[PDB]
């Protein structure tokens, strides 16, 4: 009972949905976890095999169904709604740890207003005697001031997950503030996701261009470019690199999250030609490809400054951005204003992504039961309830020692086997039950043109093989998850993470057996 008011609002909403902290922070992190450029070889193959095809697929399904993401697949076939349920579970478990990064980002923002940058000096109440300045570091028991800051000021590092500590209040208050900024932005101005943002949309691109120019100008970038580009065929046999590359492809474009299907489902039949899908895919691929240039150039500068190997300069964990950016902005003149602008830009990206996902999930939940809900004051109950539940549940990652739970969430929840499972089932059903020929006939009149033979040999052959092979190789060749290559997780922690992944995985067989029973 709702549709877009402008033809450009849908495009802006979709665009804002996929550009953000996934292709500027996690992408360099995942490409840095595995040495060399071996990340790139599966990147392009998985892109042209599953990314753009599915990216068009749920869009066209949503526009044909004009209904919620949980029920869009229901319209296609009565079974396989486990895809939608797994998507909603994945997004619900993804928001929890996707807002904590914004929480400490805004903590950095508030801590950046000071006259002198806290991470540019060595003497603080949270610094060990093993504190040497990186400028004179080159002048095996020494670290850099930013490394000490990241692990002893923003969040104190407990010796392990087995020993949780005391709940920190600064990060909890910052994350509550983020939730308050997100709540008022939802129950007021629902159209603001694409209405007033027309002039602010160019701001992140301009800031990214400035960052790219500054990073390219920054010395010691040749090593970073070589590491980013040139591949390493030596270590392709283990499935770690393929798994992370495929999951990054499926992460940046937000496949299997039930968001793009709803965004396209807002529009009614006979929508414009979907060349915009291939346009937006190319736009996001280019943004991700160019951000890595600046990121790896600044990591190359850090490597040439500290004097250690490129693979060991950072923590190889989710703190890559917050250890790379400060070292780049400390030398570049006028640190304070540029730091403020940079962190507000990060908040903009994270926020837009956060409320888009929240809108999608809330739309799915309200479409699940429409009898009990109506557009009006009644939305307050189910917005406040979900916000409070998420705030309380995400309080276990801001405590000292909550970093480990965050890393477990990053590795298992909303990534890895669950995404491949859901995508493989989507392609399998759409190709071998409904039929690609039916979709071509349905879209011929809508588009006005017959697409080339590239949606039938990519929905039925290319994607299922690259999903099942990676899944089987991951099962056969197993390596326990490690943090910073040093810590060894307890067995019950690995069991908890595997249960986290299996909760999303098991959605499909459960609904299949339930529908088979009756
Ligand atoms: C932030 C946390 C709480 C998220 C946890 C995962 C949720 C996405 C799951 C957990 C329980 C699920 C619900 C469990 C039961 C139902 C009832 C079901 O329809 C029924 O009423 C029939 C079955 C019944 O009576 O429960 C529709 C899906 C729904 C709302 C599920 C929607 C998805 C939910 C909320
Ligand atoms: C329990 C642990 C191991 C996993 C974490 C919980 C959720 C990830 C899963 C587990 C069982 C799932 C439920 C199993 C069965 C159903 C019924 C099915 O809904 C219906 O078809 C409603 C009835 C109907 O319309 O016929 C799909 C949603 C739901 C509530 C599922 C929602 C998601 C749940 C709660
Ligand atoms: C660190 O050095 C500064 C300047 O040398 C000094 O003022 C300060 O007391 C020292 N200790 C701490 C904890 O800052
Ligand atoms: C070692 O000391 C100075 C002190 O700032 C440092 O900047 C420089 O790298 C070194 N000086 C030399 C090698 O003359
Ligand atoms: C310095 O590094 C050595 C490594 O051989 C280590 O044994 C020592 O504990 C470290 N610290 C000091 C103060 O020597
Ligand atoms: O790539 S992002 O836009 O930042 C985000 C989008 C939603 N799925 C996780 C990544
Ligand atoms: Cl990407
Ligand atoms: Na975004």
From Swiss-Prot:
Residues 103-168 are extracellular. Taurine transport activity is down-regulated upon Ser-273 phosphorylation. Taurine transport activity is stimulated by thyrotropin. Taurine transport activity is inhibited by GABA, hypotaurine and beta-alanine. Its main location: membrane. GO terms for biological process: alanine transport; amino acid import across plasma membrane; amino acid transport; gamma-aminobutyric acid import; import across plasma membrane; modulation of chemical synaptic transmission; neurotransmitter transport; positive regulation of cell differentiation. The keyword Transmembrane applies. One of its GO terms (molecular function) is amino acid transmembrane transporter activity. Glycans are attached at residues 123, 139, 141. GO terms for cellular component: apical plasma membrane; basolateral plasma membrane; cell projection; dendrite; GABA-ergic synapse; membrane; microvillus membrane; neuronal cell body. It is a multi-pass membrane protein. It comes from the Eukaryota. The keyword Phosphoprotein applies. It is found in: Cell membrane. Keywords: Cardiomyopathy, Cell membrane, Disease variant, Glycoprotein, Membrane, Neurotransmitter transport, Phosphoprotein, Symport, Transmembrane, Transmembrane helix, Transport. The modification Phosphoserine is found at residue 273. It catalyses: 4-aminobutanoate(out) + chloride(out) + 2 Na(+)(out) = 4-aminobutanoate(in) + chloride(in) + 2 Na(+)(in); taurine(out) + chloride(out) + 2 Na(+)(out) = taurine(in) + chloride(in) + 2 Na(+)(in); beta-alanine(out) + chloride(out) + 2 Na(+)(out) = beta-alanine(in) + chloride(in) + 2 Na(+)(in); hypotaurine(out) + chloride(out) + 2 Na(+)(out) = hypotaurine(in) + chloride(in) + 2 Na(+)(in). Pfam families: SNF (PF00209). The chain crosses the membrane at residues 10-30, 38-57, 82-102, 169-187, 196-213, 249-266, 278-299, 332-351, 381-399, 416-436, 457-476, 496-514. Expressed abundantly in placenta and skeletal muscle, at intermediate levels in heart, brain, lung, kidney and pancreas and at low levels in liver. Belongs to the sodium:neurotransmitter symporter (SNF) (TC 2.A.22) family. SLC6A6 subfamily. It is linked to Hypotaurinemic retinal degeneration and cardiomyopathy: An autosomal recessive disorder characterized by low plasma taurine, childhood-onset progressive retinal degeneration, and cardiomyopathy. Mediates sodium- and chloride-dependent transport of taurine. Mediates transport of beta-alanine. Can also mediate transport of hypotaurine and gamma-aminobutyric acid (GABA). This is Sodium- and chloride-dependent taurine transporter. It comes from Homo sapiens (Human).
């Amino acid at each position: 009972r709702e549709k877009w008011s402008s033809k450009i609002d849908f495009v802006l909403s979709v665009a804002g949905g996929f550009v953000g902290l996934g292709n500027v922070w996690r992408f360099p992190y995942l490409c840095y976890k595995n040495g060399g450029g071996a990340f790139l070889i599966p990147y392009f193959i998985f892109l042209f095999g599953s990314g753009l095809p599915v990216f068009f697929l749920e869009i066209i399904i949503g526009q044909y169904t004009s209904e919620g993401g949980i029920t869009c697949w229901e319209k296609i076939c009565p079974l396989f709604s486990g895809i939608g349920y797994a998507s909603v579970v994945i997004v619900s478990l993804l928001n929890v740890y996707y807002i904590v990064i914004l929480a400490w980002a805004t903590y950095y923002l508030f801590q950046s207003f000071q006259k002198e940058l806290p991470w540019a000096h060595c003497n603080h109440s949270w610094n060990t005697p093993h504190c040497m300045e990186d400028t004179m570091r080159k002048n095996t028991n020494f670290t850099s001031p930013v490394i000490e800051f990241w692990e002893r000021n923003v969040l104190s590092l407990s010796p392990g997950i087995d020993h949780p500590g005391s709940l920190k209040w600064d990060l909890a208050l910052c994350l509550l503030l983020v939730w308050l900024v997100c709540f008022f932005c939802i129950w007021k101005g629902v159209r603001s996701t694409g209405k007033v943002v027309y002039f602010t949309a160019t701001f992140p691109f301009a800031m990214l261009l400035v960052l790219l120019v500054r990073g390219l100008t920054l010395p010691g970038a040749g090593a970073g470019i070589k590491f980013y580009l040139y591949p390493d065929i030596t270590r392709l046999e283990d499935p770690q690199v393929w798994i992370d590359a495929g999951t990054q492809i499926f992460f940046s474009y937000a496949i299997c999250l039930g968001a793009m299907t709803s965004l396209g489902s807002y529009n009614k039949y006979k929508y414009n030609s979907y060349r915009d899908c291939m346009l937006l895919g190319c736009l996001n691929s280019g943004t991700s490809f160019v951000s890595g240039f600046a990121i790896f150039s600044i990591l190359g500068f850090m490597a040439q400054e500290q004097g250690v190997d490129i693979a060991d300069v950072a923590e190889s964990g989710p703190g890559l951005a917050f250890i790379a950016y400060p070292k780049a902005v400390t030398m570049m003149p006028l640190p304070t204003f540029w730091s403020i602008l940079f962190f507000i830009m990060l908040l903009l990206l994270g926020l837009d992504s956060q409320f888009v996902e929240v809108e999608g999930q809330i739309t799915s939940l309200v479409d699940l039961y429409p009898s009990f809900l109506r557009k009006g004051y009644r939305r307050e109950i189910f917005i406040a309830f979900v916000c409070s539940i998420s705030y309380l549940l995400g309080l276990t990652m801001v405590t000292e020692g909550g970093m480990y739970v965050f890393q477990l969430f990053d590795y298992y929840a909303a990534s890895g086997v669950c995404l491949l499972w859901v995508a493989f089932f989507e392609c399998f059903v759409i190709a071998w039950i409904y039929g690609g020929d039916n979709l071509y006939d349905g879209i011929e009149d809508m588009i006005g043109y017959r697409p080339g033979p590239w949606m039938k040999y990519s929905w039925a052959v290319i994607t299922p093989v690259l999903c099942v092979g990676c899944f089987i190789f991951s099962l056969v060749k197993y390596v326990p998850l490690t943090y910073n290559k040093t810590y060894v997780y307890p067995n019950w922690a690995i069991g908890l993470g595997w249960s986290l992944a299996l909760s999303s995985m098991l959605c499909v067989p459960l609904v299949i057996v339930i529908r088979l029973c009756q």
